[PDB]
Design a protein around this nucleic acid. Sequence first.
DNA 1: TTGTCTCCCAAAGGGAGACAA
DNA 2: TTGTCTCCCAAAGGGAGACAA
Lengths: 289, 289
Amino acid sequence: IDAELWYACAGPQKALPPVGSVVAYLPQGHIEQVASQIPRYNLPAVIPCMLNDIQLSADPDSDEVYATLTLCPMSKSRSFTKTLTVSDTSTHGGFSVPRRAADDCLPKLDMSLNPPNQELVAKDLHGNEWRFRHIFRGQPKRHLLTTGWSVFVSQKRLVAGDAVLFLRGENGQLRVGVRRAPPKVLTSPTMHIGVLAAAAHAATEKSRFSLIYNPRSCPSEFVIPYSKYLKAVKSNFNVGQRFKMRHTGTITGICDFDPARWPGSEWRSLQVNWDESSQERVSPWEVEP
Amino acid sequence: IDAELWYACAGPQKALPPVGSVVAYLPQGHIEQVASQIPRYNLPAVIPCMLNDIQLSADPDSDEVYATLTLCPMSKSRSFTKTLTVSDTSTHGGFSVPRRAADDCLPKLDMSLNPPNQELVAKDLHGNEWRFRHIFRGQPKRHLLTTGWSVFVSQKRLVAGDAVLFLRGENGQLRVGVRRAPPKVLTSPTMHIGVLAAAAHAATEKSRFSLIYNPRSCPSEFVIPYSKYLKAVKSNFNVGQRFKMRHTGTITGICDFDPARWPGSEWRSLQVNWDESSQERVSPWEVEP
DNA sequence: TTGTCTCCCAAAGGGAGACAA
DNA sequence: TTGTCTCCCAAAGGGAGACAA
Ligand SMILES: [Cl-]
Ligand SMILES: [Cl-]
């Protein structure tokens, strides 16, 4: 069940492609992630790759999640999320659990008692256990978390604006995680050169290479199912078409995102204007007509 | 004076070479730092480089120090350090200042008063100010730090085994720093490939490239003055010679550290046995006969 | 010399409804 | 519905010598 926790801490719509399936590796997207004179490398804009391995992991102190993926080029369970408020982080009080959250995720309280209460034990990404006291009190009544909250906010160093996740599997085990609100080993040019050179060798030799996916630090996925890439490139978009991605927008143009470095590429090849003002260049597979 | 603080947080004997001087870039050492199938790159084992720029910096949250250096290949003020003990970090009590520390570093207390005391204001690497109360009390008497200590240990998240630094310049300004007791963006092969490829292009084209120095994460310096490299290579070592580095040892052999990848290199080319048991391969410039 | 303990008084917070958004 | 406030009783800690390493 921890694997389902990892995707929760990552994001609701991450959906990593399944190991052993063909995927489209898009180097320009890999470059955008590790960006959150130089040797130029002649390299294809999409590299169809076999997904050889996925390793999910998390940094214990930072609690951030990342995955190691191994590529070789070729020839639903109940949960809830809440963004933390001031009273949740502040020393006084506890944690206000949303009403919909307690009925669908947390185990159902025995309302015969007064106040209804249970000792909740939850596991985080690294196997630790956290004992929260889940109570039903106040006027008007509300679901709170008291005993373990003060300890939990202090060791995981949460502040307001972050968010906590709770995830119950069909198993008895309850799982908890946190998602924090949004250059120390190599310089940017060296990181740049590294990505493209590993990819260039891997593409020419048809040999294994590896990369790290940071779903939180990733503006858009750069390892997507190869069939999803092919369907969007086959489908013809035209200016003025109506698409969704739920936000709605209109396609204002279709050209290359970078004709100098990455010519002929479908990466962010669509120019769109957003209907509601609340990035104007997106890729074909992200939008749906 | 903050530049002298950076070298304190780095280490006592770091002594970065001065900008504008010729240096010897040793790729194998750069590789050892970022290590704390693959394309092989034909590259020299020492690259004489002009040191174009040094940028000293520090991560605010982690408090770790690193420097960005720009290379182009070609054709004392009073301070004290104390490792933190349990009573220094524990909630009760304060901070015990060593006796030698208060007389040579901290401003001299006015012992006419009772208890002698002063409000100390210190700056860390990032311009912040910390107010400590420096008192002389106890029986037998001792120099302590009280008021600001509890706050300082909690925000900088110090534990036992770390160390605090205090540094007074000739200016009135007092400076404080901490040194903490001893793969999230790129995989190791990609980092490897990046270092060597940036160096290979920079060496062939005689163009600028950059690197990051992590003095705490660095087992031995890999950017050294070019004259220091040349003197040690000119000097002939022989087996059984007596050297110092203060520890004392004997030279047991002289061969290549890696004949396959880095042949003919002077990097860690000396085999030594240590006189006191309390790495047995070192480079010529680190040892002194 | 200095780390660690004990213990005292004040502070800081765990947890409880009271109130509007 | 739920964030925030107030305020009460217990806890946790700031700071002070007392003692050996
Ligand atoms: Cl895992
Ligand atoms: Cl600086």
